[PDB]
Design a binder for this molecule. Sequence first.
Ligand SMILES: *[C@@H]1O[C@H](CO)[C@@H](O[C@@H]2O[C@H](CO)[C@@H](O)[C@H](O)[C@H]2NC(C)=O)[C@H](O)[C@H]1NC(C)=O
Ligand SMILES: *[C@@H]1O[C@H](CO)[C@@H](O)[C@H](O)[C@H]1NC(C)=O
Ligand SMILES: [Ca+2]
Ligand SMILES: [Ca+2]
Ligand SMILES: [Ca+2]
Lengths: 235, 83, 440, 166, 79
Amino acid sequence: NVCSTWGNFHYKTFDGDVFRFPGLCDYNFASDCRGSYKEFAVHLKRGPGQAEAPAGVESILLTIKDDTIYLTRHLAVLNGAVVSTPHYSPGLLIEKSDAYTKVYSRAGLTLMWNREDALMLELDTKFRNHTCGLCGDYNGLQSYSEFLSDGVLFSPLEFGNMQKINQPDVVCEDPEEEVAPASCSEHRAECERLLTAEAFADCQDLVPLEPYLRACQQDRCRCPGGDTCVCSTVA
Amino acid sequence: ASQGQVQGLCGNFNGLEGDDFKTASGLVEATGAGFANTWKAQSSCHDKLDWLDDPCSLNIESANYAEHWCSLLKKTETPFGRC
Amino acid sequence: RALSCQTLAAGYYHVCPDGLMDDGRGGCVVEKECPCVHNNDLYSSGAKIKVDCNTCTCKRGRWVCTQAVCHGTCSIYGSGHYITFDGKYYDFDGHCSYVAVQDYCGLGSFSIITENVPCGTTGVTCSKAIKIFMGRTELKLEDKHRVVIQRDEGHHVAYTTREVGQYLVVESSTGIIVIWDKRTTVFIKLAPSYKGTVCGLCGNFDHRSNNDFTTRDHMVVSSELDFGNSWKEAPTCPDVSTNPEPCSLNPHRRSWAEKQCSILKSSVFSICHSKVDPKPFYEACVHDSCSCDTGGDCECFCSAVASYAQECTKEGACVFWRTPDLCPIFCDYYNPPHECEWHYEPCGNRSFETCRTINGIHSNISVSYLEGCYPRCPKDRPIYEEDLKKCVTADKCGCYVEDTHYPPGASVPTEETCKSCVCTNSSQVVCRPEEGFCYW
Amino acid sequence: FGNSWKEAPTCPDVSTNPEPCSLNPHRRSWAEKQCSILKSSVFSICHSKVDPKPFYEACVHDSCSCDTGGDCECFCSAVASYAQECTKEGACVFWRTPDLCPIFCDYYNPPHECEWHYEPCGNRSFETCRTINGIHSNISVSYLEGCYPRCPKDRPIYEEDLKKCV
Amino acid sequence: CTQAVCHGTCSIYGSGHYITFDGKYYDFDGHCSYVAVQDYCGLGSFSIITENVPCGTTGVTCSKAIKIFMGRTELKLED
Ligand SMILES: *[C@@H]1O[C@H](CO)[C@@H](O[C@@H]2O[C@H](CO)[C@@H](O)[C@H](O)[C@H]2NC(C)=O)[C@H](O)[C@H]1NC(C)=O
Ligand SMILES: *[C@@H]1O[C@H](CO)[C@@H](O)[C@H](O)[C@H]1NC(C)=O
Ligand SMILES: [Ca+2]
Ligand SMILES: [Ca+2]
Ligand SMILES: [Ca+2]
């Protein structure tokens, strides 16, 4: 299926489970914890904090079984060399459109990233019961082991904290537990009206609605003023 | 004055470094873990096996750091250059 | 108090009841029937195994072995990798003629020299010829052939040259053996009568490896580059100062080398991982692949992998690792037009009949572990004559006089006087006198 | 003419043709020595039926360039290209030796029954289970090098998608 | 001789050596996806594309994969 991340630090695993982890240092977005041989690993790197509304990404590291791709805002590097996109190696395709950057692999990996905030990854069915990154496992269970492993219901922040990567030159502090804000249910009508418009007719049966509107709930109240933070969800 | 009268993970101390893996029950082993397992002080412990990998290939973010500093040992101008 | 047949000698310093002890195979057993272990293999009581010249037995969880002295072996291979008689690996990259072994150690009976020349552009050097001085005769292994020189008039110390698998084997009746793969590898084997009476790059073979760095003038040093530099032959040859690092001087060739040489650590050689440590061979493979940068670099790699496969065979693990895309071997080239007799033997464990051994001649070493193509002669002429590589009848093989093959019937050349010789029609060389004065 | 047929507009434009043997002088001596087999007496039959110069130049040009690994695979293909034309015009030449571009055919054989053989110039037509049912091609590919079966007389149909005599 | 029209042949080989259908040799070292053949020539039925990538450090390039479009089917010769 698809793991996704967008908006004001909104995440979505392979089994739904939309939450919010405002980490900023570095994290293991996805990986192959088969144990014998690691086929691939996607590492995400947030920014230093762009502003209150947006939440960008600095660069992405993506290793597939022999080679590393380092994608930045302006350039893409393969094995330490700058490549003029597109590239057509016999086991890997990189292309750079204006609205997206796309990477296709023969192992069953597809990555699509717009250079600002939105990122999504698609894997085949081969990697079920093996993924171990921030996107949770890929067993198809809805929040089964991602948050309730040994009976303890993990809060999103602590679950995200465990997925950190230690860079042996810089110490980065994890975010502290914020005071539980009020359930922003006062803006539910606005989110429902905006999302369930006419232009979104033939997908009311393809994608659910509850998670994406719940995401709009916090987005609307956490992001006062400009509507740069609500229209990044309906996107 | 104790040449050949010691046994353990530190060898026999007789001048030859080929019989160092000589177990306490005759023949010589081939790997480093096979010989070591025979000197456990607690019967309940399990047996280990060698590890055919290099850590500098699994932790890429650390490879540059490790190199940039450990390479100082070969720099003649550095204080270690004297040795 | 819980013994386990592996902590027997430990002491139990820090399940089964009192008496019986765990064996690691299953239920508890008495001390008498306690098994033995070796290279991650579990052998019950009363078993048998061989170690390179001897035979052992699991008696009481302890091994009891015969005590005979195996031969001594020195190895030269790769771009300057040396293994001495007492097991001390090292590296050395010289450009001169160096004393591999000899007996003129401070009056001597032989000497074995080597010729190292540069191969690459990073400064590394490799062996490309061998010279063997025996008494007064001088053999030279060169250009994939053996050349005799200064053959002594009437002493002619008995030797024997033949070809086994992909290797060329030269033995001497005195107790010297040289095995050469025709490209860069060399094995020197010595009988246990030379113990502690040799010197050279291969140490002095005394079962003690803290004094194999003895220089020409009987001084013990601690540096490879000083030990090596003192055994050069021509005084005008330069002196080595530093060991080059190939993969650092050719960064663009690293990616390939580290990918092809990784097969040693793959699952293909999973059987051999518990019997031979692969790291010192993986390092040599990578070191060699980064250096062959002037052509023919698919040949530096196959030999490096074969060096490890041969040891795996020698220790008892016959592994089949060649594929049509990885170091292929072309054996049936030797077959007759379309009769199929030559076969690629992955680990050489075959003992057939030649026309040498048919007449009682026997070697002194087991070379039954060398890779290559081997015959499977048919049942209408089942004797393998070696000097022509031909399956022939037991009658028409040859004579093999003075290390020279002569076809049956052919008038045998003779360096004597008044003595004519002929190979009979019975594989028998017989000589007659001629009274043309001289008599019988 | 070349730069106008690229598919992606963002792809760069070629400005010059590099000279491998000039940028890698130390590899020239080897390349000019191995590739000389084309002009040697081994291919004496084919010299009057195919001009070797454009293939000699290709061999030398390729051998000077494969300078990152596996340069014994750039050379054998270059020589095989010329050998294939020599076969195509009516000159079947046997040039492989255990030291020069060896080929490993008996790998496919069952344990020790000998049925696969290296066919130097492919001039052999046998019965597959496609042609046994009237299926035929529209060109002759009877000049392609490789290893071919010689299926026995008790199951003489060669199935292709498994490489088996049945 | 009899007069029948043989098939036509185009050859790609080596580090960017090309032989056209009419017998013209040349060299070309590109790094992109190039049209080997097609009949959408100024409405056509097929197309054959090639994929050249660098192989070496001197700048030369060689073909490493093929794509065949026929009607709507797409074969890819690779690995
Ligand atoms: C194997 O070793 C034996 C032991 O020496 C060799 O036998 C010697 O042969 C020479 C000449 O043939 C005699 O002068 C010696 O007296 C023999 N030695 C003994 C102890 O009798 C034998 O030649 C060696 N094998 C080969 C093939 O040479
Ligand atoms: C494991 O089985 C398959 C993949 O092997 C997967 O679809 C399933 O959801 C997994 N179930 C559990 C309990 O891990
Ligand atoms: Ca789950
Ligand atoms: Ca010791
Ligand atoms: Ca010694």
